[PDB]
Design an enzyme around this catalytic site. Structure first.
Site, short mmCIF file in Angstrom:
data_model
loop_
_atom_site.label_atom_id
_atom_site.label_comp_id
_atom_site.label_asym_id
_atom_site.label_seq_id
_atom_site.Cartn_x
_atom_site.Cartn_y
_atom_site.Cartn_z
N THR E 30 50.51 60.31 58.22
CA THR E 30 50.94 59.38 57.18
C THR E 30 50.76 60.00 55.79
O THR E 30 50.04 60.99 55.64
CB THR E 30 50.16 58.04 57.23
OG1 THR E 30 48.80 58.25 56.85
CG2 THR E 30 50.22 57.42 58.62
N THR E 31 51.41 59.42 54.79
CA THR E 31 51.39 59.98 53.44
C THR E 31 50.09 59.64 52.71
O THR E 31 49.60 58.51 52.78
CB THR E 31 52.60 59.49 52.61
OG1 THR E 31 53.80 59.60 53.39
CG2 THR E 31 52.75 60.31 51.33
#
Ligand SMILES: [Cl-]
Lengths: 244, 231, 240, 195, 243, 235, 111, 241, 250
Positions: E30-31
């Site tokens: 995920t970012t």
């Protein structure tokens, strides 16, 4: 991990042989021949140096024949560097026994321990075995004169006459032919040189390509003397038997 | 393929196959469910036998008076990890006179599993765990995966056909979260949840395993005739 | 330290390194054990591709572990020395703590345990050796003969053989040994042992070793002429 | 423990060792044999600290018996004595040293000669015609200096030994409850039952 | 070939393929981002809501080291926790011997050397995380990003994960439009916007926003989580910008 | 090659699964639990007629209240038995009581997964552990090299196990007497054994609260064999 | 030189009836001629209907009780919640005490 | 062919892992250069900051090992920093043990010995870096000593490292053929830095701004790096001649 | 972590060869030529200084190294391997001899210790053999002057004269024609320079050639006076100027 690069030096083949031991024996079969002959009044050790160069210093040289103590010597066939590791261990072991019991070590006891070290490298530790075969020549007051051999497997046996290294098959047949039990040292000297002369891969056997040694009781009364032959002495003994 | 020989090797797409194979052992395991309200937390587990002559493999283990878990996958690995939790809960009590927070329990399991995924010679743990507990911040439910990933949830399920119970709990979320001060009803909801994962077999008296912990309830396990009430 | 698991299971449930160690035993010189009514006899083959041997100093095939128990073997000679040494040390250790020499069963159980340990320890290969262990328990006149093998299993035998062509000599012993009436004397037991080796050996010259163990630490090795008399006698009865 | 003596004559070594075991104000035993047979032609007597003595003796016995089985051969008395000395010489710089004094009587079959060695707990070895450990020596050495001859028989040696025990029984403070006497010669080790 | 089967082996290019394979695990995650500001740093991360059954606000991903450093990472979450545990040990021993709390550059090299050490042997696996971290020390604010190889640099802004390129582009605009500097409270709002904009690359599952910050004036030089009114204000700012 | 502790793609440990194949090659062992006791029986299976069968030891005492039968690579069982005996005696030293049968079994099973790159490989032997304690009464456990153990009312392990287990499924009920169980083990052993069953190639044993663990004589088993043959002919 | 032991005074008493047992102890805690506490309990319920007191050097007394209480907890974990009988507790406490034979817990213990 | 994976000999007596570590050296695509003055030793290196989001002040391949010794690295930064930390620790220990500052050539030998071990021991990979050590030694004067993954090291009149190293090397060779001396015959370090940049410009054929370069200078009793404005001051001086 | 390579990397092949040793000897063959000649009153060892770059200062790289005051060494093969062997060789002369007997070891025994170190790299876990052959020249009171060759296997041989490396085959043949047992040290230096010119291609002067002798004691190189028994090192490295003087009367 590192499993990828492990040769597994201490495993069995499907036939029940130890790969590395077999291959070490194959290595030893290319080394210069060494012969041991046991007579009733002494022992002869004879060995052929590996293809010599004329600029090699011959007198201050040692390659085949080593002294373990005053009563025991060995002839080497295989990697010299490997042999010196084992020789130093054997020399120390002899002194440990002398320090403990105040008596010179019996020949077999020294041979067994050196052979037990070789055995270990074939069962555990993952290391390559020592690429060396020994001929042990020695004297003690239990069995008198004794010849033994050991090889990379750590197996040892006793002999009246034996060869190691190159052309053992041909050498053994020749020794089996001319050896008899009532033989004397000077006769054994002649047999050893004659056998090497016929089994050699060289053109002609000369003084500079040989190491020679005797273990006699030919000192003065009831004591044993080790004679590692000098170059000139090998030159003379080669003439005395009419090889050159 | 060429990258699944050990845990120390990444695949070209960045996967750890040994960890994924360990995850697969959980999927073959018998279903177990976890859910909680604000006052209580409940584990429900379907036990599995070898045949009709054998006992039913116990799925639930007590870790402390206020904490415990259920297992799916390699049972010996659950024994190792539960034993570690028992020690960690115990260390917290002896040294700090403090009940181990269910959240810290999760962090400790994560870090223990992780070390087995980065070194040569070792292997990942082959078991999934559902940890329930009641501590100073109320009731809790955790999900442990042997990849190291630990997750806090209102409800969940792991094992074979766990997707049925997980969907049910996702629908029932608003109902069961407000079952406060009523143990038997929270269990009923968990027993109905695990029923969505059954095929050809139904819940019997030596088949069902239920555990509960809460505000005025120590972690206790129910087996045999004590679960007949809920069938 | 070298750690590699060398002895491991294969898909079919075999441990190949243990099984290949049995092949090393099959290559070794034949060894046979026969127990009578009041004795046990250990017979051993010695290959004759080795002339110019010195038999005074060459390691004997049958080894004394204590004054009342003996051990013979088939397989790798170097490997057997390690087992014999450990057995001899345990023999003295048992006398020291229990104040009584080992039973033959106990000494066998120890040797077998050592062999087993080398089948599930890292960095080591199994022993390429099977042993025959014979003797008499302290203050006991009942003969004892046990066999061990690389896997670590051991058992008691009325008569048994190991090594190359052992299946041939086992066949002989299976029809020539009566459980209801074991060789009543020393002479009978030695003869049945020599007969069984003559099925496999070659010449009855310096190829056969015989060692007789009787109760109360009475162990002696036969000489060439003594064995040769059994060889001469058996052949004359055969021409019939 | 306390009294151990040794006499080497023409054809044998004779060891005499006291029978008493005393702890506090009580003689617990009056028939204790303070000796171990190391090999068929080698005997060792011992005296010193309680526990240490028997533990050391039996440890040496085990090692010599192990050697005998391994080599199918009997170590010479000289060789055994050197092994024992070295073990005590190691011991004296250990965390807890063996407080044991020994005499080793043996018959060398290769030389056809009796041999007596005296070794103390420090590892001090000497070969002697006659030996003693502890306070015994303060009476017996001077006595033997006078009456001992190198060509004596076993019977003459036993009479010479009776003279020593009599002196000790007259002038020693403690009751050591007599001695067990053992002879080492070409035929091995045997015990004199009536002394 | 086979050069990619073992860690610490050089390929004929001079590359360690196992590290490059660990980078793929990071790109899958995920970012997460980091924004350096006037007197501090701001960290934010995307938390994918896999199910309704996840308890909101209760699966915290940003981690504190000592009392003045924050750490966030993308990729294998357990690997990141291992790195933070080491970071906490390193920071504790520094404070033990030298009294002062560990400076951010000093802390950066401690993590760097430790991650680099896991590229030296075939008996260990490289880290499957890129870690964005930083804080405030005696010399002001510092932001760092550390990669599986052990490589790290100082950053004005940093981004990693599945939406790194989207986030990087958005970060570059802030650096260009604010040469004098961005304020702490502004950077919190911007962090929310960038996570929402970077969520377009992961838009199947909806997500939960998590922010933290260290500021000399706003948090007194200590690491704190953004919660309640300040969080909702930052969420609303982000919601207004996507529409 | 490959790691010793490696998982297969189906989520199983290769070495553990392979050791289970070794156990299938082993000789048959059967156990039946009743309210009057637990019976343990094994096939001896001598490899040759010259081998003295009474030296084959596949049923073994752990303590007075716990016995054990084995199947597979039986040499591997020695250290397992040694551990079990020490665990049982040690617990008595520490707590002045008998150790529970389940606790004993759990202790033995803790050794199982202690292999890798600890011992070099899993055990190649399965154990049937039978005993009695005051809390849970008469119990029978099947201990595997996976580290897992199940309690059983009846269980067979070894080469004839799947056929013998199906037979035990039909025959077992909760009211079996000890004598009924003894005959049932003999009956099912005779069915799955290669050679004809007698007192020399099969061995019986039991554990009761009153008399503890006992291995039966060859004379006692021979009469139970004769009683069994007569009862099958009687209808 | 540092002395690792101290004396915290107090006294304890145990009597057994036919179907009951009492374990009593005063609540005073002292060092030298000073009172540390007028109410510091040293008789504890350890679970499984076992009460215990270790009187003498309070630090050792607390350590022992703490270790035995923990021993009861693990006895349950390892032996399926089985009740620890008083005779089994006694034997367990012997091993706790003798384990420090060469650096003893300075207490008289009664359960 | 596992002889290409670890540091064992190939049939032709080569170590491929060492050779591949040499190729990792150029992975950064940066060129470095070192020259000696009368009183000083100057080292320069290219500085490429591609990402706009990077803090340019933290991007460096020049390290201050001790007060007197500086080191520039050609190779990836993780390995570069690994080498730098070890060099710093070694130099500090030397001073404590032997009572005087570690000479540049002795540190070079020590780091070269460590590198040699990785070429002989299997479990340790070589570092994919080339280390150039610079100082003004109190005995030997201005000094440049360089280490590689093979464990080789030697002193230099001047040197260069990187992808376009050969161009810079010959450029320097041709100057020293002309000048007939072992160094830059210049009084101030400022002009030796100017010489270094000038001859790098000629050899590479590129122009440099203040942020395209990185400069380290060693004088008696200190080694220091230059700021962007120090380099800018130096770039202006070259342009005005 | 930790060295998991506890197994041998050099093993016997079916034909009996030890692969890694053979391959190490191949690396020695690629190496630059070095030689040694023994005279009646001294020994000379020589080699070419192959410069890696003309910007490199070849004086800072020493191929001929002092091991003890009476023993020197030169090599062919891998330079880094040689450098660490010289470090280990210098130390072992002290630890296993000088610190015990209060004097330096005789040539044969120091050679024996270096050989041991090289043998162990052939058998121990997780290491490759050394990729060098050494020529060690030295003097001691009871053996006089001597010259030894040490190979990657650990084997060593005494020589009257020999060469190793690139053009060793031709250089050995050249030395056979010129060597006699009456050579004086200056005659041996002359022959050493002649032999080396055949294998050297580029510049042939005192800056490209490295040469040292084992000869008379050098009191001027001792660094102190007052002890009659201490008379100075027999090892001396010839200067660049001293080589050029002999290259004119060549
Ligand atoms: Cl160094």
């Amino acid at each position: 991990g590192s499993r990828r690069y492990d040769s597994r030096t201490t495993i069995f083949s499907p036939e029940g042989r130890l790969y590395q031991v077999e291959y070490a024996l194959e290595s030893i079969s290319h080394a210069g021949t060494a012969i041991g002959i046991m007579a009733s009044d002494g022992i002869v050790l004879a060995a052929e140096r590996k293809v010599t160069s004329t600029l090699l210093e011959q007198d201050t040289s040692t390659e085949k024949l080593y002294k373990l103590n005053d009563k025991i010597a060995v002839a080497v066939a295989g990697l010299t560097a490997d042999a010196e590791i084992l020789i130093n261990t054997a020399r120390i072991h002899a002194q440990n026994y002398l320090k403990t019991y105040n008596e010179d070590i019996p020949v077999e006891i020294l041979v067994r321990r050196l052979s037990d070290i070789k055995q270990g490298y074939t069962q555990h530790g993952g290391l390559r075995p020592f690429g060396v075969s020994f001929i042990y020549a020695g004297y003690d007051d239990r069995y008198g004169y004794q010849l033994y051999t050991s090889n990379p497997s750590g197996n040892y046996t006793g002999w009246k006459a034996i060869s190691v290294g190159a052309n053992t098959s041909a050498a053994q047949t020749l020794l089996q032919m001319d050896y008899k039990d009532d033989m004397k040292v000077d006769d054994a000297i002649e047999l050893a040189l004659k056998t090497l002369s016929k089994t050699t891969d060289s053109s002609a056997l000369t003084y500079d390509r040989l190491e020679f040694a005797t273990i006699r009781k030919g000192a003065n009364d009831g004591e044993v003397y080790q004679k590692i032959f000098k170059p000139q002495e090998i030159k003379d003994i080669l003439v005395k038997t009419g090889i050159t | 393929n060429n990258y699944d020989g050990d845990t120390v090797t990444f695949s070209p797409t960045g996967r750890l196959f040994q960890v994924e194979y360990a995850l697969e052992a959980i999927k073959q395991g018998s279903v177990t469910v976890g859910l909680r309200s604000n006052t209580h937390a409940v584990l429900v587990a379907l036990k599995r036998n070898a045949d009709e002559l054998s006992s039913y493999q116990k799925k639930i283990i007590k870790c402390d008076e206020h904490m415990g878990l259920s297992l799916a996958g390699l049972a010996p690995d659950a024994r190792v990890l539960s034993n570690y939790l028992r020690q960690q809960c115990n260390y917290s009590s002896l040294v700090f006179n403090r009940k181990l927070a269910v959240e810290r329990a999760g962090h400790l399991l994560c870090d223990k599993a992780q070390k087995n995924t980065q070194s040569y010679g070792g292997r990942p743990y082959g078991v999934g765990l559902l940890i329930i507990g009641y501590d100073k911040s109320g009731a809790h439910l955790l999900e442990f995966q042997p990849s190291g990933n630990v997750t806090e949830l209102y409800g969940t399920a792991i094992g074979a056909r766990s997707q049925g119970a997980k969907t049910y709990l996702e629908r029932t979320l608003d109902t069961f979260i407000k079952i406060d001060g009523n143990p038997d009803e929270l269990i009923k909801a968990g027993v109905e949840a695990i029923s969505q994962s059954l095929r050809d077999e139904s819940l019997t008296v030596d088949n069902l395993s239920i555990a509960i912990v809460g505000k005025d309830t120590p972690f206790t396990i129910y087996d045999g005739e004590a679960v007949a009430k809920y069938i | 330290g070298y750690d590699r698991a060398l002895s491991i299971f294969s898909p079919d449930g075999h441990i190949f390194q243990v099984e290949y160690a049995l092949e090393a035993v099959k290559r070794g010189t034949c060894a046979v054990g026969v127990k009578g009514k009041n004795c046990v006899v250990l017979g051993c083959e010695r290959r004759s591709t080795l002339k110019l041997q010195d038999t005074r100093i060459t390691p004997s095939k049958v080894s004394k572990i204590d004054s009342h128990v003996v051990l013979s073997f088939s397989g790798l000679n170097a490997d057997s020395r390690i087992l014999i040494e450990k057995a001899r040390v345990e023999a003295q250790s048992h006398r020291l703590t229990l104040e009584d020499p080992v039973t033959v069963e106990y000494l066998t159980r120890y040797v077998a345990g050592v062999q087993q340990r080398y089948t599930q320890s890292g960095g080591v290969r199994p022993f390429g050796v099977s042993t025959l262990i014979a003797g008499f328990d302290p203050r006991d006149d009942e003969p004892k003969l046990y066999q061990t093998e690389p896997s670590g299993i051991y058992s008691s035998w009325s008569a048994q053989t190991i090594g190359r062509n052992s299946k041939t000599v086992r066949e002989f012993l299976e029809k020539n040994y009566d459980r209801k009436e074991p060789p009543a004397t020393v002479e009978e037991c030695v003869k049945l042992t020599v007969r069984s080796l003559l099925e496999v050996v070659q010449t009855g010259a310096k190829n056969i070793e015989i060692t007789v163990v009787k109760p109360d630490s009475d162990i002696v090795a036969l000489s060439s002429e003594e064995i040769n008399q059994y060889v001469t006698q058996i052949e004359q009865e055969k021409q019939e | 423990m306390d009294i151990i003596l040794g006499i080497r004559v023409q054809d044998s070594v004779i060891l005499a060792s006291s029978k008493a075991v005393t702890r506090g104000i009580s003689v617990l035993k009056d028939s204790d044999d303070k000796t171990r047979q190391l090999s068929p032609h080698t005997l060792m007597s011992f005296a010193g600290e309680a526990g240490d003595t028997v533990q050391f003796a039996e440890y040496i016995q085990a090692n010599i018996q192990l050697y005998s089985i391994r080599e199918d051969y009997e170590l010479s008395p000289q060789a055994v004595s050197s092994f024992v000395r070295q073990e005590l010489a190691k011991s004296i710089r250990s965390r807890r040293p063996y407080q044991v004094n020994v005499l080793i009587g043996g018959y060398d079959k290769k030389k056809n000669k009796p041999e007596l060695y005296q070794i103390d707990y420090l590892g001090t070895k000497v070969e002697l015609p006659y030996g003693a450990h502890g306070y015994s020596g303060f009476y017996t050495f001077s006595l033997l200096d006078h009456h001992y001859r190198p060509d004596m028989t076993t019977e003459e040696g036993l009479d010479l030994l009776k003279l020593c025990v009599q002196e000790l029984e007259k002038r020693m403070p403690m009751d050591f409850k007599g001695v067990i006497v053992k002879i080492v010669d070409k035929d091995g080790i045997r015990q004199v039952d009536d002394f | 070939t086979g050069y990619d089967l073992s860690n610490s082996v050089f390929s004929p290019d001079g590359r360690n393929f196992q590290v490059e394979y660990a980078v793929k695990a990071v790109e899958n995650g995920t970012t997460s981002i980091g924004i350096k500001c006037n007197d501090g740093v701001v960290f934010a991360v995307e938390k994918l809501i896999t199910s309704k059954l996840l308890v909101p606000q209760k699966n915290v991903k940003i981690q504190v080291v000592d009392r003045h450093i924050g750490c966030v990472y993308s990729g294998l979450i357990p690997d990141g926790r291992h790195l933070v545990n080491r970071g906490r040990e390193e920071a504790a021993s520094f404070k033990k011997l030298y009294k002062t709390p560990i400076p951010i550059p000093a802390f950066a090299d401690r993590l760097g050397q430790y991650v680099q050490a896991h590229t030296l042997y075939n008996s260990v696996r490289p880290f499957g995380v890129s870690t964005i971290f930083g804080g405030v020390d005696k010399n002001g604010a510092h932001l760092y990003m550390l990669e599986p190889s052990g490589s790290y640099w100082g950053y004005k802004g940093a981004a990693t994960g599945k939406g790194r390129q989207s986030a990087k582009a958005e970060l570059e605009k802030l650096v260009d439009h604010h040469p004098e500097g961005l304020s702490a409270r502004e950077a919190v709002k911007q962090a929310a916007k960038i996570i929402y904009l970077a969520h377009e690359d992961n838009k199947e599952k909806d997500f939960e926003l998590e922010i933290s910050w260290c500021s000399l004036s706003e948090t007194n030089g200590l690491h704190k989580f953004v919660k309640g009114d300040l969080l909702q204000e930052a969420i609303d700012f982000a919601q207004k910008e996507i529409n | 090659d490959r790691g010793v502790s490696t998982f297969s793609p189906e989520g199983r440990l290769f070495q553990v699964e392979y050791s289970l194949e070794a156990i299938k090659l082993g000789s048959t062992a059967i156990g039946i639990a009743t309210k009057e006791g637990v019976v343990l029986g094994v096939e001896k299976r001598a490899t040759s007629p010259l081998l003295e069968s009474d030296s084959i030891e596949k049923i073994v005492e752990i303590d007075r209240h716990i016995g054990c039968a084995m199947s597979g690579l039986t040499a591997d069982a020695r250290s397992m038995i040694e551990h079990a005996r020490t665990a049982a005696v040690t617990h008595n030293l520490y707590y002045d009581e008998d150790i529970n049968v389940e606790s004993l079994t759990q202790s033995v099973c803790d050794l199982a997964l202690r292999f890798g790159e600890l011992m070099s490989r899993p055990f190649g032997v399965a154990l049937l552990i039978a005993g009695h304690d005051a809390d849970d009464g008469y119990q029978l456990f099947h201990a595997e090299p996976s580290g897992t153990f199940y309690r059983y009312n009846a269980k067979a392990i070894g080469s004839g196990s799947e056929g013998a287990q199906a037979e035990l499924l039909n025959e077992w009920h909760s009211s079996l007497t000890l004598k009924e169980a003894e005959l049932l083990v003999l009956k099912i052993l005779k069915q799955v054994m290669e050679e004809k069953l007698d007192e020399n190639n099969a061995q019986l044993s039991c554990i009761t609260k009153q008399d503890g663990f006992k291995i039966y004589d060859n004379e006692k088993t021979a009469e139970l064999i004769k009683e069994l043959k007569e009862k099958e002919a009687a209808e | 030189q540092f002395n690792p032991y101290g004396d915290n005074g107090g006294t304890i008493l145990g009597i057994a009836g036919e179907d009951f047992a009492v374990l009593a102890g005063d609540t005073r805690n002292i060092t030298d001629y000073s009172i540390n506490s007028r109410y510091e309990p040293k008789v504890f319920d350890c679970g499984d209907n076992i009460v215990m007191s270790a009187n003498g050097f309070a630090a050792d007394g607390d350590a022992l009780v703490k270790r035995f209480k923990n021993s009861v907890k693990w006895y349950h974990f390892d032996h399926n919640d089985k009740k620890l009988s008083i005779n089994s507790a006694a034997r367990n406490i012997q091993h706790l005490l003798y384990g420090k034979r060469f650096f003893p817990y300075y207490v008289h213990t009664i359960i | 062919g596992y002889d290409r994976h670890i540091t064992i000999f190939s049939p032709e007596g080569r170590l491929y892992q060492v050779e591949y570590a040499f190729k990792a050296t150029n992975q950064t695509n940066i060129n470095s250069l070192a020259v000696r003055g009368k009183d000083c030793t100057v080292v320069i290196s290219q500085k490429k900051v591609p990402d706009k989001l990077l803090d340019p002040t933290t991007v460096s391949y020049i390290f201050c090992i001790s007060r007197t010794i500086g080191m520039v690295v050609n190779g990836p930064i993780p390995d570069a920093r690994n080498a730098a930390l070890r060099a710093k620790a070694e130099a500090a220990e030397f001073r404590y043990k032997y009572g005087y500052d570690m000479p540049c050539d002795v540190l070079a030998k020590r780091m070269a010995n460590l590198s040699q071990i990785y070429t002989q021991r299997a479990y340790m990979r070589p570092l994919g870096v080339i280390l150039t050590f610079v100082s003004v030694d109190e005995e030997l004067g201005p000094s440049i000593y360089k280490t590689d993954p093979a464990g080789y090291y030697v002193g230099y009149k001047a040197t260069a490292t990187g992808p376009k190293q050969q161009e810079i090397t010959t450029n320097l060779e041709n100057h020293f053929k002309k000048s007939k001396i072992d160094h830059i015959n210049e009084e101030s370090w400022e002009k030796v830095v100017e010489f270094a940049i000038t001859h790098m410009i000629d050899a590479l054929g590129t122009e440099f701004s203040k942020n395209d370069l990185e400069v380290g200078v060693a004088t008696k009793d200190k080694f220091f790096t230059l700021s962007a404005e120090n380099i800018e001051e130096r770039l202006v001086a070259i342009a005005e001649q | 972590m930790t060295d998991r390579y506890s197994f041998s990397l050099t093993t016997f092949s079916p034909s009996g060869k030890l692969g890694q040793i053979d391959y190490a000897l191949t690396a020695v063959k690629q190496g630059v030529t070095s030689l040694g000649i023994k005279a009646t009153n001294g020994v000379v060892i020589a080699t070419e200084k192959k410069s890696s770059s003309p910007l490199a200062m070849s004086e800072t790289l020493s191929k001929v190294s002092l091991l003890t005051p009476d023993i020197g060494a030169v090599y062919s093969g891998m330079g880094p391997d040689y450098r660490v062997l010289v470090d280990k060789s210098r130390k072992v002369a002290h630890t296993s001899y000088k610190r015990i007997y209060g004097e330096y070891p005789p040539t044969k025994l120091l050679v024996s210790e270096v050989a041991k170190i090289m043998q162990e790299a052939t058998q121990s876990g997780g290491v490759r053999p050394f990729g060098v052959s050494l020529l060690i020249a030295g003097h001691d009171e009871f053996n006089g002057f001597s010259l030894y060759q040490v190979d990657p296997s650990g084997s060593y041989f005494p020589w009257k004269a020999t060469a190793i490396g690139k053009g060793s085959v031709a250089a050995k043949t050249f030395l056979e024609k010129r060597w006699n047992d009456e050579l004086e040290l200056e005659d041996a230096i002359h022959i050493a320079l002649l032999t080396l010119k055949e294998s050297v291609e580029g510049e042939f002067n005192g800056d490209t050639i490295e040469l040292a002798i084992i000869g008379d004691e050098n009191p001027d190189l001792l660094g102190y006076t007052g002890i009659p028994t201490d008379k100075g090192p027999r090892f001396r490295k010839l200067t660049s100027q001293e080589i050029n003087d002999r290259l004119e009367a060549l």
